[PDB]
Design a protein around this ligand. Structure first.
Ligand SMILES: [Ca+2]
Lengths: 61, 96, 97
DNA sequence: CCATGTCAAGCACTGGCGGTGATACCG
DNA sequence: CGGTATCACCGCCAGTGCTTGACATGG
C-alpha cells in the first residue's frame, strides 16, 4: 500500500498514475490502454510506451 | 519544416548494415527497438533513427549496439571501429 | 535552455588534472593553448575551455589531448579512459563476416 | 471479427554539445 | 610581445514525445 505508494515515487506522477489505473488501484477496474489513453488525452500506444518505461523504472532500483 | 540534413553515404551504409544485423538477430536475442533503447538509456524512436540512417551513430552508441546485438562494431561500421581503436591507443601507458 | 550545462565535480577534476599536465610539459613539448588547439582543429578558446573547466571533455578530445601531451587518458580522466576501453571491447568481441 | 496489445517509422521540437572570436589582460 | 582569459554569443542535431499504419491473437 504505502510501501507501494512510496514505491511508485521515482516516476512522474503520470507514469505512476498510468500503472495504478492499469492495475485497478484507482477505482477498482483494470483499465485498458485505450481507456487510460482517453484519460490522458493520448493514444493507446503512447500509454503502452509510458507504462513500459515506468515498469523498467521500478525494476532497476 | 526544415528537414534534417542527410548523413554521408558511408554513414548510411553503416546504418543499413546495423539494421540488417538487428533484423537478422532480433528474434533469437529477443529484442525490439524499444527494448534495445532501454538498454541504451533512450527511447524507441531514438534507436530507430539510428537504425534507419536518420541520426548519426557515435562511437559510444555503436559500441552499445554491438554489445546488445552480440557482434563486433566492425560488422556494421569499420570507420567507427577504427576510431575506437585510435582512442584506445591513448589509454596505453607504454614502456619506460 | 541555458545553452551550456555546468560540469559535474568529477569533470572539473579531470580538467584540473588535464591542465596541470599541460603546465608541466608545455616546455618540453613546445606547446601553447594555441598550438594545441591547432593540433585538434579548434581555436584557443576551445582548449582554454577544456583546460579551465568550462566545457567538459569527451572521449575523442581526451584521447587527442593525451596523445599531444604524451600521457595516457587515465592520468587526467580515469572515467573517460574506462569508457574508451569498454568501447574497445565492443570492437574486439563477437567478430564474424 | 475485432479489442487489445505490439512494433516500427515519421515528424515538430529543443537541450545542450561543442564549440567561435573579438578584445582586454598578464608576466 | 607571447600567452591566457574569459566574456559574450549560438548553430545544429541527437534524442524526445507523440502519432500513424500494419499486424498478431485470445476470446
Ligand atoms: Ca574544428
Amino acid at each position: 500500500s504505502e510501501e507501494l505508494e512510496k514505491a511508485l515515487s521515482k516516476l512522474s506522477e503520470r507514469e505512476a498514475m498510468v500503472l495504478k489505473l492499469r492495475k485497478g488501484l484507482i477505482d477498482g477496474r483494470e483499465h485498458t490502454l485505450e481507456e487510460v489513453g482517453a484519460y490522458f488525452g493520448v493514444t493507446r500506444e503512447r500509454i503502452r510506451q509510458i507504462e513500459n518505461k515506468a515498469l523498467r523504472k521500478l525494476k532497476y532500483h | 519544416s526544415t528537414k534534417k540534413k542527410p548523413l554521408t553515404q558511408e554513414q548510411l551504409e553503416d546504418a543499413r548494415r546495423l539494421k540488417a544485423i538487428y533484423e537478422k538477430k532480433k528474434n533469437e536475442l529477443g529484442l525490439s527497438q524499444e527494448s534495445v533503447a532501454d538498454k541504451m538509456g533512450m527511447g524507441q524512436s531514438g534507436v530507430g533513427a539510428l537504425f534507419n540512417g536518420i541520426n548519426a551513430l557515435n562511437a559510444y552508441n555503436a559500441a552499445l549496439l554491438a554489445k546488445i546485438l552480440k557482434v563486433s562494431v566492425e560488422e556494421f561500421s569499420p570507420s567507427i571501429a577504427r576510431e575506437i581503436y585510435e582512442m584506445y591507443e591513448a589509454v596505453h601507458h607504454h614502456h619506460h
